[PDB]
Amino acid sequence: ADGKILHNQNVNSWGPITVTPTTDGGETRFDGQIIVQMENDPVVAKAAANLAGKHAESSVVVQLDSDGNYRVVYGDPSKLDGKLRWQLVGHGRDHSETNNTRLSGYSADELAVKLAKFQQSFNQAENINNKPDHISIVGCSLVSDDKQKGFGHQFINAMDANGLRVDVSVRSSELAVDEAGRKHTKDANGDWVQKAENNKVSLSW
Ligand SMILES: O=P(O)(O)O[C@H]1[C@H](OP(=O)(O)O)[C@@H](OP(=O)(O)O)[C@H](OP(=O)(O)O)[C@@H](OP(=O)(O)O)[C@H]1OP(=O)(O)O
Numbered sequence: 680a681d682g683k684i685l686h687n688q689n690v691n692s693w694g695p696i697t698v699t700p701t702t703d704g705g706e707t708r709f710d711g712q713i714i715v716q717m718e719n720d721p722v723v724a725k726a727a728a729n730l731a732g733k734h735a736e737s738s739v740v741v742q743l744d745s746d747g748n749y750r751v752v753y754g755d756p757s758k759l760d761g762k763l764r765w766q767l768v769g770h771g772r773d774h775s776e777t778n779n780t781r782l783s784g785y786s787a788d789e790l791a792v793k794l795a796k797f798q799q800s801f802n803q804a805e806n807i808n809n810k811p812d813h814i815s816i817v818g819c820s821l822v823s824d825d826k827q828k829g830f831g832h833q834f835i836n837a838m839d840a841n842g843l844r845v846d847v848s849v850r851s852s853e854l855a856v857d858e859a860g861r862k863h864t865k866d867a868n869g870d871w872v873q874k875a876e877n878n879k880v881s882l883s884w
């Protein structure tokens with residue numbers, strides 16, 4: 680598949696990020712979150728920085744590469760406790776009948792294994808004993824339009840197969856993140872809209 684160009688190799692060669700905290704972020708149900716940046720694309724890095732700005736006091740941005748090497752590019756992993764969210768940021772690619780099949784070059788199965796290894800490596804190198812309760816998939820069209828099939832479904836299941844029983848929110852449409860770290864999706868007329876529930880599904884066991 681010959682989609683948008685991809686830079687997921689070698690985290691040390693990636694651009695760093697600047698997180699400008701927001702003032703209108705409000706409250707989150709997660710005591711902490713990891714924003715996991717899955718590729719070096721400028722738009723992905725910006726989206727990742729923007730999301731962190733929404734809950735700056737309780738967010739860590741990690742960049743994780745195709746070798747499983749990672750680096751913290753914002754925040755303090757030590758400060759993480761309680762109910763956690765992961766927001767995965769990258770480009771969806773390789774469209775099909777059930778929408779995109781790969782996030783940042785990874786199939787749902789391959790991504791699950793990466794994150795399972797990452798969880799293990801991260802928790803031991805940063806002295807933490809905390810897993811995610813939720814994974815928000817911040818990439819375009821990674822679940823079928825009817826919400827029944829696609830990457831999202833394959834992913835939640837493969838995560839469970841790799842030791843991680845999580846909830847998964849995932850979008851069936853094009854996705855953008857604004858400067859305030861808020862998600863936008865596209866409507867029928869192809870306009871950017873906010874909180875369009877027919878553009879997302881929350882998968883739960
Ligand atoms: O409380 P809001 O300002 O409306 O923000 C919500 C909230 O995000 P926060 O935790 O940052 O508040 C949702 O988190 P949940 O507790 O519902 O999980 C998130 O949903 P996801 O976790 O699935 O991303 C949703 O995003 P969406 O627009 O996709 O509904 C997002 O709204 P914003 O996009 O306005 O930040």
Ligand code: NA
Nearest residue numbers: 705706707708
């Ligand atoms: Na909120």
